[PDB]
Design a protein around this ligand. Structure first.
Ligand SMILES: Nc1ncnc2c1ncn2[C@@H]1O[C@H](COP(=O)(O)OP(=O)(O)NP(=O)(O)O)[C@@H](O)[C@H]1O
Ligand SMILES: Nc1ncnc2c1ncn2[C@@H]1O[C@H](COP(=O)(O)OP(=O)(O)NP(=O)(O)O)[C@@H](O)[C@H]1O
Ligand SMILES: [Mg+2]
Ligand SMILES: [Mg+2]
Lengths: 260, 258
């Protein structure tokens, strides 16, 4: 088999390919040593790595490894997944919502980083923990799904489509009578992260004259709400959103594809 | 006397221009009736309004007032506040950090809105409350001035060093709980200031200008927020500009769009 790995600061994404069948696997970066042991007890044709922790895995294994720069790997992997899923875009902005968020413009041939921002999955987890004391990712995200943001966010609807948020968390001081439940607070956290990401995305989309915006990154994992927030807001701000199944593995898949 | 008022959704900013001496005053929008009561019992040579609640004031006062578009009023007033305070700029992006945040590109002639985001003073108050149960504004902002964001935010250094790789991204690695009300509130202010700067920085590049001016009542009694935006703006490659009384840009502008 062939193995493509994207070892990020939070999650390690692994793509195993064999007999024209690829398996996706995700492990926490805190358990990177476990990924190392797993690799050594495996017979591998080619190992391709990317991500900030590629080196940590490389210097502790017993076979050579081809390492690639993450932005180009992600870009290549994403292009492959898009085509496999029926999308044929001439150009687009792709936002990799990982620990933080990186924005890239793909002109149809190559990618270039055009922006980044501290709002992403790490904030969802971090701020999410501060507001609910929940550390388990699945528990955190599951809970957020059924939350109501109306008593927390101030929208145009309350005071440009009425669906636009005028101020995130700007309604709180108007509902001190309300029950700011864990579910509601988390939904608002996801709301602001999603909206900020989208607002940055549609801004660069306008700048680089593309109306297509592709969303990837593990932050969407087990979080339907985040995806809904971004897709909807993207439409509202006038661009076309595209979610990619297993898009979080764009880097791992791209790395494998780039092997020489 | 001449009076310029920017009646926003949260704060009513009032500027009084004597012969050539101006005084500033802020009141809560919830007490707009008091502002009207006040105005009627006043002798005003000229009253100019702007902001979403201008209409409420206009139809309840006993004298005819002129109402202006907030974007143009702010631009006009800001441009005056700059020229006065010595800033002569060929162009710039100005960020109005009010309840929410509005982004404008002034091309040297006029302004044009190029962006808007929900992160601003409303979030500071709302998320601030959810993290400290503090309702009083002065109290909330004061408490945040002395906080340390190091155990809360994940920085590039933790992995341009002082850049933030993930707001609140360090929280799970410091669950020891040195998450004092002050450190939390400071982190709330940090992400708001950074998101605003990032957006400003991006549209500044899109519209080819190295200048970014920051105004808004959100900066009131919050030196941390001003410091956050000014420092981050440097890191992203542009030059920041802060104007004293900049939150009164609209009020001032309304009196000068004559
Ligand atoms: N099992 C999981 N555990 C924790 N976080 C998860 C999990 N699944 C998804 N996530 C979320 O996904 C985010 C990580 O996204 P990801 O695209 O993997 O970034 P990364 O590669 O680790 N970081 P970077 O190196 O900065 O590119 C986390 O911050 C979570 O919000
Ligand atoms: N005394 C105060 N009380 C409440 N908020 C204050 C006060 N001083 C400053 N602020 C902050 O200032 C923000 C309001 O900024 P401001 O520029 O006045 O917006 P606005 O004009 O009311 N909004 P908009 O209707 O959207 O134009 C609040 O959300 C607070 O963060
Ligand atoms: Mg990554
Ligand atoms: Mg305002």
């Amino acid at each position: 088999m062939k193995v493509g790995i994207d070892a990020g600061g939070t999650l390690i994404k692994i793509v195993q390919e064999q007999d024209n069948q690829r398996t996706f696997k995700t492990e926490l970066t805190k358990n990177i040593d476990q990924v190392v042991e797993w690799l050594n007890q495996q017979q591998i044709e080619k190992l391709c790595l990317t991500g900030g922790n590629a080196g940590v895995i490389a210097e502790n294994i017993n076979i050579p490894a081809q390492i690639f720069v993450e932005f180009d790997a992600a870009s290549q992997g994403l292009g492959i997944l898009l085509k496999e899923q029926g999308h044929d875009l001439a150009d687009y902005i792709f936002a990799n919502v990982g620990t933080g968020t990186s924005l890239h413009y793909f002109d149809g041939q190559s990618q270039r980083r055009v922006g980044g921002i501290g709002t992403g999955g790490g904030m969802i987890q971090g701020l999410g923990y501060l507001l609910s004391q929940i550390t388990d990712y699945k528990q955190l995200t599951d809970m957020a799904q059924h939350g109501d943001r109306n008593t927390i966010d101030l929208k145009v609807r309350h005071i440009i489509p009425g669906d636009l948020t005028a101020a995130n968390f700007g309604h709180v001081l108007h509902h001190l009578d309300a029950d700011f439940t864990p579910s509601n607070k988390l939904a608002a956290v996801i709301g602001v992260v999603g909206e900020v990401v989208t607002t940055m995305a549609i801004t660069v989309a306008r700048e680089f004259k593309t109306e297509n915006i592709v969303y990837i990154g593990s932050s969407f994992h087990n979080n339907a709400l985040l995806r809904k927030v971004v897709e909807d807001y993207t439409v509202l701000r006038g661009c076309k959103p595209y979610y990619v199944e297993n898009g979080a593995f764009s880097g791992a898949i791209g790395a494998l594809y780039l092997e020489k």
